[PDB]
Amino acid sequence: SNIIKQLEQEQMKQDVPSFRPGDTVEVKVWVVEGSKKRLQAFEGVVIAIRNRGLHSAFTVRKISNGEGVERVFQTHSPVVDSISVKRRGAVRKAKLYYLRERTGKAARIKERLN
Amino acid sequence: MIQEQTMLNVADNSGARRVMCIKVLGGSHRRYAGVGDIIKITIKEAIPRGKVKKGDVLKAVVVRTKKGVRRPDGSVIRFDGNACVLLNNNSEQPIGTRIFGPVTRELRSEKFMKIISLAPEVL
Amino acid sequence: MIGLVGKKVGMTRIFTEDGVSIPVTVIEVEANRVTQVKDLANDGYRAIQVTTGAKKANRVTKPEAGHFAKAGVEAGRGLWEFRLAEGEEFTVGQSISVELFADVKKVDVTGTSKGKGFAGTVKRWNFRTQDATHGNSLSHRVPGSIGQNQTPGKVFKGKKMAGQMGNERVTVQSLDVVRVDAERNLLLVKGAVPGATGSDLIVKPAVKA
Amino acid sequence: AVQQNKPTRSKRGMRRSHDALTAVTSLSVDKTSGEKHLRHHITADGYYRGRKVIAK
Amino acid sequence: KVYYHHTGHIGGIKQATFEEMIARRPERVIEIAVKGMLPKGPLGRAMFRKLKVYAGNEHNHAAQQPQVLDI
Amino acid sequence: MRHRKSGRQLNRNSSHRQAMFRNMAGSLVRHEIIKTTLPKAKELRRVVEPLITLAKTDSVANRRLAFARTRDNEIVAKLFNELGPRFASRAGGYTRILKCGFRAGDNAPMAYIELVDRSEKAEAAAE
RNA sequence: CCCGGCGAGGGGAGUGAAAAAGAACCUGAAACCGUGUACGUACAAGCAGUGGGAGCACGCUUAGGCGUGUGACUGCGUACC
RNA sequence: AGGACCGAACCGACUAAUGUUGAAAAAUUAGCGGAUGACUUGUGGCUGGGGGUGAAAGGCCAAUCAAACCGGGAGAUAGCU
RNA sequence: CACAGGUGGUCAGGUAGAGAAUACCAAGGCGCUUGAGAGAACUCGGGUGAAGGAACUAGGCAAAAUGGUGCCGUAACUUC
RNA sequence: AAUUCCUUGUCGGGUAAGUUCCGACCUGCACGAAUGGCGUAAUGAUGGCCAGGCUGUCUCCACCCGAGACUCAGUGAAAUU
RNA sequence: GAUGUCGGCUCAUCACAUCCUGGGGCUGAAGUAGGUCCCAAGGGUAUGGCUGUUCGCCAUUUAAAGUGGUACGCGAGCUGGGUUUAGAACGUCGUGAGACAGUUCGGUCCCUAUCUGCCGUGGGCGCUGGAGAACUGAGGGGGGCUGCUCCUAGUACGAGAGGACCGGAGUGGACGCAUCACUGGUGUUCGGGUUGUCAUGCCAAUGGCACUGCCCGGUAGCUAAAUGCGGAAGAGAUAAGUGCUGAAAGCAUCUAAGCACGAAACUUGCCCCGAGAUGAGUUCUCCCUGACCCUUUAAGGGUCCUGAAGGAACGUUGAAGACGACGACGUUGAUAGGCCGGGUGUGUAAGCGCAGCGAUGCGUUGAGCUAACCGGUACUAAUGAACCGUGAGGCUUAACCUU
């Protein structure tokens, strides 16, 4: 029918801020738990492009302190609380790997600016 | 882990350096572990002031997989390495009081209130 | 009870309010258009003939066309039939669609099977692949001796060997309806549909006790 | 492998019975010429449904 | 008397009740009773194909006029 | 098996396949009219048309862009100047396959490929 | 003289007693593969034979129940050195 | 300087992947050692079968080696098949 | 055998690179003749791999990583 | 121990483990001083074991590409019998 | 004149004399627990080490770690790791050659399937006029395993501690099927990056070639390591077993007549193949209603006119597959390629201005370029035919047709 490959675009949220890989961001999320609601954030650099209709996620890599850890927060999830853009940078590459082990002043790549 | 042998990282003040998976628990005719899984470790090193000594065999649960770990959205927390928190060998909950390095957010349950209230990550 | 002939159309990792996602397969509900509504007036046969689709029908045979004439007069895509229970059927205008799954919690799902080319030696049967070493004579891959010896002196039936898929049915059995959607016309089922996407399926209320 | 005994000549014609060349069910001529055709391909002079194509 | 066969699968002899062969397809109990009484392959296949039993008290040879026989 | 796919693999490895297409799309601009095997004519069709689309209207900067994607000197000299005003009156089907028949040397099914408005043509035979 | 590259190969026509002596030419088996015809092969089964046999083609069987060849089918039945 | 090294050409073949009615009467590709030395190596000559020739394996003697090839005794012998 | 085999003398162009390795390339050779299409098992060749790290196997074996120049830094043993 | 009738000796060690391997011991095969012995640097494509960089050998196998198979076209074997 | 092995990978299958659940009897068994235990082939029955190891030892999982056979399964499947004294040589023995059931080092192993099977698949014929569509079940297999705790239930029972089972429930484990959105794999028909040389006259910019040069991201497809998920309520015929009424022996008793209950096996239900089932099938939809000569005639032969419904070759081709078949589909056409809008990919093209020492980056532009997926578009190629199939289609008994 006319439904195939459209239903991904139809599901896809429209107030989500605009992006390129190397945009740093903050994912704000819940702890979930047994009955009590608290919040938490995760910040870093996003090393790679999303846009997957409903399945779209920020794969932020954190790299602030300690050994590297990559986190995937799916955007379209109701427990994902808030999204500041902060810096929106350019890289002309698909992967950021040389910063995996260095976490000190590593997740703060520039705003592309005027 | 997924294979036979597998050294992986100490996650507690219990030991040093590396400690060895001898088996997976929570079924048989298994070679390989799921995401939510309980591992069997021998301490392959130890530390003199740790809870345990070289070649003592105890129970454990996953905190990092180098592949990545998932449950709630199916989204992965993807790591630099495999690492494991020892449990009590029969009586559950961790034996060590500190986690060393980052944690998942797939560990967020009543039987793990011990390990997630720690400060290095997911508070 | 019958099926609703669907279309395989869509796959979604879907959210729920509680912070949980469900992997899902997404099905376009088309309406049943009846042909004749066969009942036990004629022979011992009791079953309802239903058409889910439409075709140009410039090449169709007149034997298919009188079939369609007696129907909802919509040049049907083709004929499927389903056995039925609890008395003779209601004969006019039936249009069976999303309402069928409102108290049907789990469905069976009968595909038109799985379309995996040859399938055949090793791949169909999840065998081991022969050793990559020892200079093995014209063998990096072999299924194994398929019998034994003279003692039976034959090859038994139902041993795992060769052949195509042959596109029979395959029932997965008892996978969950996650939601049904009027207006958008989606049946979201929790489990998978057989075949590549754009394939036909049956989605029928579950068979099992 | 090998074989037990020398096979029969009736066997050689039976094994070949399904692999043989099959009939064309007659032929085509043009709508538009006295030139004969090749069914559902085009002659060198373009004749199929008249016009002209491919004058090589 | 459990009408023994082994078509090609699963350890065991496989079987069929005395009760099926009259309750379902009721012809078969007589068919495979006279069968072993006939010579080799081919001529016993021509002997055999002359018997019909049908379902029972519903025979279709009304028009031939059958001569009744008590045994 | 090959479900939900498109296009065709012809005769050899990828390093050969790109190098063969540079010969074959260049021959197109040099002979204007060709005959080949029918799989071979589709890949020939599918190579040339997207270049034509870019080239459908004249632009020196887009001619520099076209030299970036397809680095041949023959194609970038024909495109924009010559071939641009030619195909301006179409949106796809700048060229057509005429199913000329089977190959004489063996039996492979062939198609002839012919630019859409081709009416001036060479009068020698081809095989 | 026909087909054909200008080829290969055969044929017709003509030559001789003879080419049913055509050039690798003497007459010519048997393996060998293929054609033409008859009868046969889809209730169909193993040394393929033996014993019994519907049928049909051909033979004016003086028609006087036959000859010729094959044979549905089937009782019986384990090669030779 | 070097019976030193890593390493081509140039000589080999510890192992590995393949070849096994092969592409080929050990070749192909890759790891590996010798490569100024007790080396590699052209030309021309020479020893002849239980005899040569061997840093020795009962090695090597015409893509052949725990017994070369040919012409003769010789129709060896046959308690055997 | 148009053998993917074997074979001595002489010569020595460009860039990058320990160098006559080696990537491309001037002079020069040359398309090692089944073809085209498909892209089944399977065979051989060719490319790749999550997590693991020999757990494969008799055996860490073409697997695969390593390799060059510059620099800091450098063990027991030793005929230095 | 390359050496051991028994035997995979006893115990420590790496080890998830340990017939082998290494260290110690004798409760010692027929060990044992030029078919030499203790001990040793460098050396050998040398043997046994281990962790790591690293790896499809494998756990557990998936897909992609080409030459045969296979499709379409040509020619056209062999072990056997 | 050939039945040819250990050890190790692959692949199994049959006998139940059952490792186990499941129904039940005994107990010096109260219940728990142990001992005793019949029925029963249906089904599940783990992995690393050392060694060439069957067997050994050791570490470990799970409720669990079976019994017997197979040229002591399986080189017309795999390998010499072993036998290894083709071969040195250590240890040992003999004057020695040579040997060793002591030992260590690497080490050549064939076969394209005749008939036969097994799985998959087509052709040919027949179903009685033909054709196209759904379809029934004569027959024959899949699943059949098995743990957990929660209720049932601290209750009967026992001196007390303790303490029943079936049935409902969700869920693991083995086993098995399907799936590609998730998480990974690949994705030689998508974008980007990068070392080198060769090239586009030269510069800006850029590409061929080095395994797809190398390398990272990647759609749809396929795929497991990831994803979904059965293993059933019910029924009957029972088994062992508690009986009931009841004898030999005035009774008792599962037995002879008789009838209640009584297991995953058996007949099944749930699942799949299946009309050649020659007692060859039904129901729905479609079409064919002209003619003469001859002879043996439920008949065939010749011939005029004449062959529909339907088929197939042929054509582009597929969400189907070796070949085919199956399927979209041939201008009436969205089949395919192009092309447009959208999908999902990549990270802001080339050109122009500018900052900067220049490489380069950046505003112009949130760019350009783009594969398989969806809808549109006839832009482009699939002409008119011809051909297999024909003019209502067997005898005969009974029923109906003036019959």
Domain ranges of chain D: 1-56
Q: What is the DSSP letter of C19?
A: S
Amino acid at A20: R
3-state secondary structure of D26: coil
> Can you tell me the distance from the alpha carbon of F15 to that of F30, in angstroms, rounded to the nearest whole number?
23
B61 CA to K66 C1' distance (Å): 34
Query: Residue B102 and residue B112: Cα distance in Å, rounded?
Result: 15
One-letter identity of residue A68: G
Helix (H) or strand (E) holding E44: helix E42-48
E strand or H helix at E20:
helix E18-23
Q: Are strands A39-43 and A45-46 parallel, antiparallel or unpaired?
A: unpaired
The answer to whether strand K lies under 7 Å from the CB of residue D11 is yes
| 3-class SS shares of chain F: helix, strand, coil, % to 5 | 45, 15, 40
Task: Please check whether strand I approaches the CB of C138 to within 7 Å.
Answer: yes
> Which residues of D in 12-41 have their CB below 7 Å from strand K's atoms?
15, 18, 22-31, 37, 39-41
Q: Which residue is nearest to nucleotide K328 (CA to C1')?
A: C55
The phi, psi pair for C26, rounded to 5°, reads -115, 120
The backbone torsions φ and ψ at residue B116, rounded to the nearest 5 degrees and listed phi first, read -100, -10
SS3 at position C74: coil
Tell me how far apart the alpha carbons of residues C202 and F57 are, in angstroms, rounded to a whole number. Answer: 51
In this complex, does chain A touch chain D, defined as having at least 3 beta-carbon pairs under 8 Å apart?
no
F26-85 residues near strand I (Cβ < 7 Å): 37, 39-40
Structure tokens at C166: 């042959």
Question: What does each C-alpha distance from C95 to B45, C57, F8 come to in angstroms?
Answer: 71, 22, 44
Q: Are C28 and C98 in contact (CB under 8 A)?
A: no
**Residue closest to sugar C1' of K342 by CA:** A6
DSSP H stretches of helix in chain C: 62-70
CATH code linked to domain F13-116: 3.90.1030.10
Tally of structural domains, chain A: 1
Which residues, at least 6 apart from B11, have a Cβ–Cβ distance to it below 8 Å?
B63, B83, B84, B85, B86, B96, B99, B100, B101
Task: For residue B79, give its domain range.
Answer: 1-123
CATH number at residue B25: 2.40.150.20
Contact residues for B81 (Cβ-Cβ < 8 A; gap 6+): A67, B8, B9, B64, B66
